């Protein structure tokens, strides 16, 4: 009875899941939260709260496989998917981890100097404490490389591009693509003859268009700080603007970075929460400032939507996922509400159901285009490549 | 026989205009090119190429002001209308210029220090050579200043907007508000029931849509340099990148203004041209690039159009002006090729003629949404204003 080890190295976490190779079910979860940190802690669960001091990123995996082992689960680890962030113009598709794999995402990592270097780290630390199991690199751009270039250059110099590799790559990329998949099937759609959005509203967010099968636009940039505004992130933001800021308060480009990065979006505008269910209920008590924040959330979301919607031949469908897209009720009527001009009308009883009700339709018959929520999981995509890829022979 | 005088204060420039006030025809057009410089020079018509050397912007106008009493026309003056490129949150009509104005346009002047101090020096000379004349003050961004916060704040703390003054104003206020008016015309529409997109696209370029009469949504930012991607000036760009460029060739906030407000856009992407006539014809003969430059013009385009549709709770119309909208019929296709998502249908023989057919539908009857070239008239727009603000009693 397989199962497959998936890991996510982020800045100062790994997020891990282990999965059934039969059903695709999770088995186990956890997360070794607070790393390189005087006290790091790890967590399965949420039962466990075993600390391990100062340790690192290979010390952790160490000790989560401790913990898979205790569980009688090391002898049944088929498969090793790895999350990568930031593949370049090098990565198409998921591929079996070799030496040319780690040493071509060495080359991409200046695109991503944070969330790259830890998945390495990840990747170096699994490729020794398991040695006979196939490892699988998944890559969160990939499924962006399918663009054309009118649709991935920047209106800066040519130098840039060629010789620095300045481009729009985008991201969420396993999510745009998973939950693209199952609208196909929701929705009783033909790839090859298809015109989807998804819009997936998180932690962080962007929009995708897929059409035929592929991505032809996102919104998200180089880095992931273009395209809606999201919780800490700003989103897309006038240049001319932040130049006139850097000579007003004197602060510098790499401090600006920072506010850009941490002190913007929704947590920005509110100077409250970088979080919904905090300021979905402020709004209702009669903070303005918050209604504000949500309102300009929206607004940017259809601003999007509608813009990327242009790179469709035809508009068939409208895909809501992530922590806030599937979850959230408001949020997705505000956002159509915007987006009436496309003929969109949404089916409140159906948009009133929450996330158990799972992947679900909620616009009604007269609307011109089908709106559906659809849940993410970067897991089991993950997975299903590495299964694809056991069958392969290196 | 009462005539309007109209006066642009560029950069390096005065570009000036006589009316008449029956008619709203040009009686006579110029331009003092090369201010500051070692040596200036005016020029009528492209007649007379009179060089007045080492002379700034109340000398200029006092030879402008010769050359219409030598014409028999300083008597007949009975306006003066001053374009105004930044009025900040102060100004949302046109005005009658007293010291209240000329303080107020002073306090704002910040948001825009090269083209606002050089209004404020045309303002003082006209002042000067023309006492009893009654002077106007029409701004390029109060046609804006009907925007809902959620559609003009950016993603940044609040901080920057209520103390700082950071936010959208949009630019191309009188075009895109003069384009509009005649739409209603040709469309034969309903100012008060009507859905606009008019694309203003030129040197400069913006979107802006017009809901009901007022602007609801408009490209470009705080600066000039949001939204399309346009001659010289990149448009839309990540920031995580352009900190990013920093990082790497080691250049300033101020360097990369540069490059982003001059080296940028169709010239930046061709290395050849920041035009248009050139680029479509190097297209036609097997450049690369200036295909790419188009492509990627085009659809940066698209993206905006559709995008600003959706502060539209209806589409009737979309309006291509400036230099290049008017005049291009290549752009204009390959714009509505794009956006086909609309069920957008362009007669060809229609889009075949030149700018001389002026104001004209260019869509076929399947079109959901007519389309229309309105030349614009900055200049007509302002006498206009000023022709109604002589009937007032200050
Ligand atoms: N309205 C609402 N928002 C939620 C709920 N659960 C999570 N979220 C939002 O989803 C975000 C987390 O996104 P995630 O990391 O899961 O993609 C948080 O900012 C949070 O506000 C919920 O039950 N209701
Ligand atoms: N294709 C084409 N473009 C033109 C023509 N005349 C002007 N343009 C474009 O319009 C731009 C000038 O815009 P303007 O300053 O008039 O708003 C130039 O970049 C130029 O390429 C024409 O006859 N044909």
Redesign the interface.
Same mark, same amino acid.
């Given at each position: 009875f397989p199962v497959v080890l998936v890991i996510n190295c982020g800045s100062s976490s790994i997020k891990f899941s282990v999965l059934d190779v039969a059903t695709c079910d999770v088995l186990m979860a956890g997360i070794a939260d607070g790393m390189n940190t005087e006290n790091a802690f790890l967590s399965i669960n949420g039962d466990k709260p075993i600390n391990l001091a100062h340790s690192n990123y290979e010390d952790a995996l160490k000790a989560i496989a401790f913990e898979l082992e205790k569980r009688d689960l090391t002898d049944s680890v088929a498969l090793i998917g790895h999350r990568i962030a930031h593949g370049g113009e090098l990565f198409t598709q998921s591929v079996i981890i070799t030496d040319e794999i780690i040493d071509n995402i060495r080359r991409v990592s200046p695109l991503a100097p944070l969330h790259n270097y830890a998945n390495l780290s990840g990747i170096d630390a699994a490729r020794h404490l398991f040695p006979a199991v196939r490892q699988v690199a998944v890559f969160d751009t990939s499924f962006h490389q399918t663009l054309?270039?009118?649709?991935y250059?920047?209106? #800066? $110099?040519?130098e840039?591009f060629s010789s #620095?590799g300045?481009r729009?790559y985008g991201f969420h990329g396993t999510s745009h693509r998973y939950v693209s998949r199952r609208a196909y099937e929701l929705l009783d759609l033909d790839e090859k003859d298809s015109?989807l959005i998804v819009a997936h509203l998180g932690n962080g967010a962007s929009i995708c268009a897929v059409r035929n099968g592929q991505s032809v636009?996102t919104s998200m940039?180089?880095? $992931? =700080?273009?395209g809606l505004?999201?919780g800490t992130?700003?989103?897309?933001?006038?240049? %001319? /603007?932040?130049?006139?800021?850097?000579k007003?308060?004197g602060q510098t =480009?790499?401090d600006?970075?920072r506010?850009?990065?941490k002190?913007?979006?929704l947590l920005?505008?509110? %100077?409250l929460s970088s979080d919904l269910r905090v300021l979905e209920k402020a709004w209702h008590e009669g903070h303005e +400032?918050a209604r =504000?924040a949500i309102?300009?959330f929206? *607004? +940017?979301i &259809? +601003?999007?939507? &509608? %813009? *990327? &919607? /242009?790179?469709? *031949? +035809? =508009?068939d469908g409208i895909i809501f996922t992530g922590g806030i897209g599937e979850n959230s009720v408001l949020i997705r009527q505000l956002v159509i509400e *915007?987006? %009436?001009?496309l003929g969109l009308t949404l089916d409140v009883e159906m948009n009133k159901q929450p996330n158990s009700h799972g992947e679900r339709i909620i616009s009604a018959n007269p609307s011109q285009v089908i709106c559906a929520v659809i849940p993410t999981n970067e897991e089991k995509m993950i997975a299903l490549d590495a299964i694809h890829l056991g069958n392969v022979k290196a």
């Open positions: 054309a270039p009118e649709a250059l920047y209106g #800066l $110099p040519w840039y #620095l300045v729009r015109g636009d940039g180089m880095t $992931p =700080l273009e505004m999201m992130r700003s989103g897309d933001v006038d240049f %001319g /603007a932040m130049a006139w800021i850097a007003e308060t =480009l790499s600006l970075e506010v850009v990065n002190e913007s979006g920005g505008i509110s %100077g +400032r =504000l309102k300009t929206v *607004h +940017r &259809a +601003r999007h939507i &509608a %813009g *990327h &919607a /242009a790179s469709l *031949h +035809r =508009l *915007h987006l %009436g001009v």
